[PDB]
Enzyme design. Sequence first.
Site, PDB file in Angstrom:
ATOM      1  N   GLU A   1       0.774  -1.233   0.000  1.00 22.26           N
ATOM      2  CA  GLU A   1       0.000   0.000   0.000  1.00 22.26           C
ATOM      3  C   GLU A   1       0.809   1.288   0.000  1.00 22.26           C
ATOM      4  O   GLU A   1       0.410   2.262  -0.631  1.00 22.26           O
ATOM      5  CB  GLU A   1      -0.940   0.023   1.207  1.00 22.26           C
ATOM      6  CG  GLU A   1      -1.990  -1.079   1.225  1.00 22.26           C
ATOM      7  CD  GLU A   1      -2.956  -0.992   0.059  1.00 22.26           C
ATOM      8  OE1 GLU A   1      -3.048   0.086  -0.567  1.00 22.26           O
ATOM      9  OE2 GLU A   1      -3.638  -1.998  -0.224  1.00 22.26           O
TER      10      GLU A   1
ATOM     11  N   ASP B   1      -8.571   7.502  -4.696  1.00 20.63           N
ATOM     12  CA  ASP B   1      -8.635   6.194  -5.333  1.00 20.63           C
ATOM     13  C   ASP B   1     -10.055   5.715  -5.598  1.00 20.63           C
ATOM     14  O   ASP B   1     -10.809   5.404  -4.675  1.00 20.63           O
ATOM     15  CB  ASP B   1      -7.903   5.151  -4.482  1.00 20.63           C
ATOM     16  CG  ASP B   1      -7.941   3.766  -5.102  1.00 20.63           C
ATOM     17  OD1 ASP B   1      -7.395   3.595  -6.211  1.00 20.63           O
ATOM     18  OD2 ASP B   1      -8.523   2.848  -4.485  1.00 20.63           O
TER      19      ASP B   1
ATOM     20  N   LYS C   1      -9.524   3.735   3.583  1.00 18.55           N
ATOM     21  CA  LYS C   1     -10.550   4.692   3.206  1.00 18.55           C
ATOM     22  C   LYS C   1     -11.397   4.977   4.437  1.00 18.55           C
ATOM     23  O   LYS C   1     -11.339   4.234   5.419  1.00 18.55           O
ATOM     24  CB  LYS C   1     -11.407   4.125   2.078  1.00 18.55           C
ATOM     25  CG  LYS C   1     -10.628   3.943   0.791  1.00 18.55           C
ATOM     26  CD  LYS C   1     -11.523   3.480  -0.346  1.00 18.55           C
ATOM     27  CE  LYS C   1     -10.766   3.511  -1.657  1.00 18.55           C
ATOM     28  NZ  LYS C   1     -10.336   4.892  -1.990  1.00 18.55           N
ATOM     29  N   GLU C   2     -12.176   6.054   4.397  1.00 14.31           N
ATOM     30  CA  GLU C   2     -12.997   6.407   5.546  1.00 14.31           C
ATOM     31  C   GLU C   2     -14.022   5.329   5.895  1.00 14.31           C
ATOM     32  O   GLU C   2     -14.259   5.057   7.069  1.00 14.31           O
ATOM     33  CB  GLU C   2     -13.702   7.749   5.305  1.00 14.31           C
ATOM     34  CG  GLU C   2     -14.592   8.190   6.460  1.00 14.31           C
ATOM     35  CD  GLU C   2     -15.178   9.574   6.255  1.00 14.31           C
ATOM     36  OE1 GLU C   2     -15.626   9.868   5.129  1.00 14.31           O
ATOM     37  OE2 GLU C   2     -15.195  10.362   7.224  1.00 14.31           O
TER      38      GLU C   2
ATOM     39  N   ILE D   1     -14.506   3.359   9.461  1.00 14.46           N
ATOM     40  CA  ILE D   1     -15.740   3.314  10.231  1.00 14.46           C
ATOM     41  C   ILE D   1     -16.058   1.856  10.559  1.00 14.46           C
ATOM     42  O   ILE D   1     -16.368   1.517  11.702  1.00 14.46           O
ATOM     43  CB  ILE D   1     -16.914   3.934   9.438  1.00 14.46           C
ATOM     44  CG1 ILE D   1     -16.709   5.447   9.318  1.00 14.46           C
ATOM     45  CG2 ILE D   1     -18.236   3.607  10.113  1.00 14.46           C
ATOM     46  CD1 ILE D   1     -17.768   6.164   8.493  1.00 14.46           C
ATOM     47  N   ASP D   2     -15.962   0.996   9.551  1.00 17.54           N
ATOM     48  CA  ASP D   2     -16.244  -0.424   9.731  1.00 17.54           C
ATOM     49  C   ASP D   2     -15.312  -1.126  10.720  1.00 17.54           C
ATOM     50  O   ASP D   2     -15.719  -2.087  11.371  1.00 17.54           O
ATOM     51  CB  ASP D   2     -16.206  -1.146   8.378  1.00 17.54           C
ATOM     52  CG  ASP D   2     -17.472  -0.926   7.557  1.00 17.54           C
ATOM     53  OD1 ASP D   2     -18.278  -0.038   7.913  1.00 17.54           O
ATOM     54  OD2 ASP D   2     -17.658  -1.638   6.546  1.00 17.54           O
TER      55      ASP D   2
ATOM     56  N   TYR E   1     -11.024  -5.161  10.966  1.00 13.83           N
ATOM     57  CA  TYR E   1     -11.781  -5.338   9.734  1.00 13.83           C
ATOM     58  C   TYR E   1     -11.845  -6.810   9.340  1.00 13.83           C
ATOM     59  O   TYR E   1     -12.896  -7.313   8.935  1.00 13.83           O
ATOM     60  CB  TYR E   1     -11.142  -4.511   8.614  1.00 13.83           C
ATOM     61  CG  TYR E   1     -12.009  -4.342   7.383  1.00 13.83           C
ATOM     62  CD1 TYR E   1     -11.963  -5.262   6.332  1.00 13.83           C
ATOM     63  CD2 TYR E   1     -12.871  -3.252   7.266  1.00 13.83           C
ATOM     64  CE1 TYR E   1     -12.755  -5.089   5.188  1.00 13.83           C
ATOM     65  CE2 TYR E   1     -13.665  -3.076   6.135  1.00 13.83           C
ATOM     66  CZ  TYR E   1     -13.599  -3.994   5.104  1.00 13.83           C
ATOM     67  OH  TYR E   1     -14.384  -3.808   3.994  1.00 13.83           O
TER      68      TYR E   1
ATOM     69  N   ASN F   1      -8.083  -5.060  -0.133  1.00 10.47           N
ATOM     70  CA  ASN F   1      -8.166  -4.353  -1.402  1.00 10.47           C
ATOM     71  C   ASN F   1      -9.566  -4.250  -1.986  1.00 10.47           C
ATOM     72  O   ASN F   1      -9.877  -3.279  -2.676  1.00 10.47           O
ATOM     73  CB  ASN F   1      -7.247  -5.020  -2.429  1.00 10.47           C
ATOM     74  CG  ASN F   1      -7.246  -4.303  -3.768  1.00 10.47           C
ATOM     75  OD1 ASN F   1      -6.876  -3.132  -3.859  1.00 10.47           O
ATOM     76  ND2 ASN F   1      -7.658  -5.006  -4.816  1.00 10.47           N
TER      77      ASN F   1
END
Length: 122
Positions: free
Chosen positions: A18, A29, A41-42, A46-47, A72, A94
Amino acid sequence: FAGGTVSQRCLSCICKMESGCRNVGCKMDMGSLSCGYFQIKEAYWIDCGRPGSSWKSCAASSYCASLCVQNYMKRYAKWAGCPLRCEGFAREHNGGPRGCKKGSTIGYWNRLQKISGCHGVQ
Ligand SMILES: CC(=O)N[C@@H]1[C@@H](O)[C@H](O[C@@H]2O[C@H](CO)[C@@H](O[C@@H]3O[C@H](CO)[C@@H](O)[C@H](O)[C@H]3NC(C)=O)[C@H](O)[C@H]2NC(C)=O)[C@@H](CO)O[C@H]1O
């Protein structure tokens, strides 16, 4: 890196893939910004439980970012039926919740394995 179901070797490989595992900042992206060591990513942040003081602050921390990845995978990996090893975790990273089932992420896995010490990483 933070501990969990994803191995330290796997996290190192994803981190290198990355950003060469550096605090590289953000990049636009496919519709949204991806930031830091793991290019998170945002939505991903959050997840994974909104760790750290903020999304971008967490992303800029190798530890916070890796903890997010750990959370995650704990949340989606087995749920999505992914191989519980780097091949699956990398693809989830990804491609999202069901990224390990997306043909799209096959390339990501192959490219990541070209990194020194990452071929066949578990
Ligand atoms: C490291 C990183 O940022 N990887 C990116 C992936 O996260 C991203 O896939 C998208 O992931 C988000 C976050 O998990 C998905 O949103 C979630 O979707 C679930 C299940 O449908 C829903 O219940 C959640 O509410 C929702 N969370 C939020 C906060 O919105 C989203 O569906 C994924 N997108 C796709 C198209 O699969 C991929 C996108 O290509 O990019 C990676 O870089």
